[PDB]
Structure formats: structure tokens, C-alpha cells
Amino acid sequence: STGSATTTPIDSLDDAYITPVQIGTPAQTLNLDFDTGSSDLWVFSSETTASEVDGQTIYTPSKSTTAKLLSGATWSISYGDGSSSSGDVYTDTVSVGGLTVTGQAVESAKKVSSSFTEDSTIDGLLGLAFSTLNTVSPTQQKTFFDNAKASLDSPVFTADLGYHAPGTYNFGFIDTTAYTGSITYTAVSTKQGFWEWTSTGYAVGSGTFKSTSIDGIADTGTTLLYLPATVVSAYWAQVSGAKSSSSVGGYVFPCSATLPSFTFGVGSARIVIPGDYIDFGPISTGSSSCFGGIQSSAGIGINIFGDVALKAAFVVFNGATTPTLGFASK
């Protein structure tokens, strides 16, 4: 089997991408944030505290003839940005782009933190990291991909995120028309539960490539590119007037600037992030200070190849017995 679904930016900055997901019988379609940095499929629901729902579409398990309470199971998650959610668990039928999993754990939120409430466009998350990170207790549950894997034509999914445009998540096949050149594959460590890999270096604009190992994670659920402070300083030094602002929370730059590209290495291959992908717009409405899309990871503990980086590539998440990642230009 295969599946193919369009993923759409939630706003004009590509802050996140939503993909429609069919849950239950008859289907209830929710727009979920596919997140290769986490491993829970959780949704706003009829059980979510009413004051914490503000425009999201909710899953109502009582209206699904295939929903079953997973008795005793609870979940609670906290994300790298400080947001969180928690609740109980149902199993139900879940379909993405024509690919159907029966008995998928659907984690129904009883509580969500304010950042989720305040984003009316995201009805929940669909985790695509390794199932060892799933938070359901006392019986850890499998991700949608893990449940689907055996049925797929090939045990892979691909992320093809658009810049200021829709893109595609495919399951079970490589669309060889979706990229240029070849796909370069690179080793993955699953020891932390992430799609963790080592970039071979970077370049700023037309500058020389610096060969240096940068361990990080491929994370579709993170907007920006978070890299070591040395790398980030080298990038922003090429933008006149750019500076790190403790009050804003990262590097800002004059909105009048033209940003240089940023290249990262994948083995001997190179992925070029155009400068315009690094512009996240005014820090507040009407400001002439703009927020940068490349930020320091120094306070995180891990480097994160988020959407800024991933949207410049066609990315293969190869879930074979020894997982690997593939990157192609597009």
C-alpha cells in the first residue's frame, strides 16, 4: 500500500504545515501537524477542556463506530518549545492520503497548553519519530508509520515541504519526479528516538564550504533551523545590522536586508537554503526588525534541522531495519 497527502502552510510565514487526516467511522477529518520530532498522535477532542478549544476541529470518539477506549491508558507530552498536552487514549481507524491503519492509538486531549489553544489551524499532532518516544502509559503505543510500515510497498515516508506553498507527505514510495539529481542517504542514530544524523558542514552565501560534523535531528515539527552558536554567528555576520537580541529571543535583522543563502552538507552532497527562506518577518506588526530563520541551538541541547532546512530538500525517512535519511535537491 501507499498514501499521499498534501501538506499546507498554516500562515504566510510557513510557521507550520497541516495535513488532513481521517479518523474514525464515519471519517472525522482533522488537520494535523506531522512531526518527525515526536511520536504521539494526539488530537483536540470532545474531551478537551472547553475553555482550551478556540476554533479547532475536534475528534468525538462517541460518534465513531470503530473507536474503542484503550482502558487505563494516559498520555502527557511536553515539547521543546515549552508547550504541552495530556489526556486519555482511544484506538480507531486512521487514514492519511488513502493509507489506512486500523487500531491506531489516537490520544485524546483533555488539556492543552495555551500555545495550542491560540492556534486555531492545528487540530493536533501526528508524530513520526521512533515509537520509543511515545508517551502513552502504561503501554507505549506505536506511531502511524510504525503501524503502517509492514503493509507499505517500501518502509519509507517522504517529506516535500513547500516554501510559501503546499507540499506533500508520501508513505510507502519514492516519487522520483519530485526531486532533481540524486538522493544522498546518510546514517541515522535512533538512540534518542529521533531521526538523528550528522551533517558534513556548511557554507554561508557564496563562501567556502566548512567541513565539520554537525549532529542534529530532522524535525518537521520545528519551524526554524537551530545550529551551533559558531555556525549561526558566521551566518548573521554576513547580514549588515543583524544581531542577537536577548529581549526578542534570538537573531534579528533589518527587514531591508537581502539575506544570503545557507548550505548544509549531506555526505558529499549539498542542500542550499535560499536566503528568502530565512526571513521570518517583522518581530511585531509594523516593525522594521525581522526575525531570523537560523538560530542558535546552544540553549536546546541538540541541533535541529527544522522546516527552514527541510523545505529546501526532498527528504526520505527510510524506516528499514537500519533506518537512514535521504536528501535531494528539488
UniProtKB/Swiss-Prot annotation:
Q: A single Gene Ontology molecular function, please?
A: aspartic-type endopeptidase activity
- Please list the residues that make up the active site: 35, 199
Biological processes, Gene Ontology terms:
proteolysis
Report what the protein is called.
Answer: Endothiapepsin
The disulfide bridges present are 255-290
Tree of life domain? Eukaryota
**Mind listing the UniProt keywords for this protein, alphabetically?**
Aspartyl protease, Disulfide bond, Hydrolase, Protease, Signal, Zymogen
Q: Which residues form the Peptidase A1 domain?
A: 17-328
* Record bears the keyword Lipoprotein: no
Species the sequence originates in: Cryphonectria parasitica
Q: What is its EC number?
A: 3.4.23.22
Catalyzed reactions per annotation: Hydrolysis of proteins with specificity similar to that of pepsin A, prefers hydrophobic residues at P1 and P1', but does not cleave 14-Ala-|-Leu-15 in the B chain of insulin or Z-Glu-Tyr. Clots milk
Report the gene name. Answer: EAPA
Full protein stretch here: 90 to 419 of 419
The family this protein is said to belong to = Belongs to the peptidase A1 family.
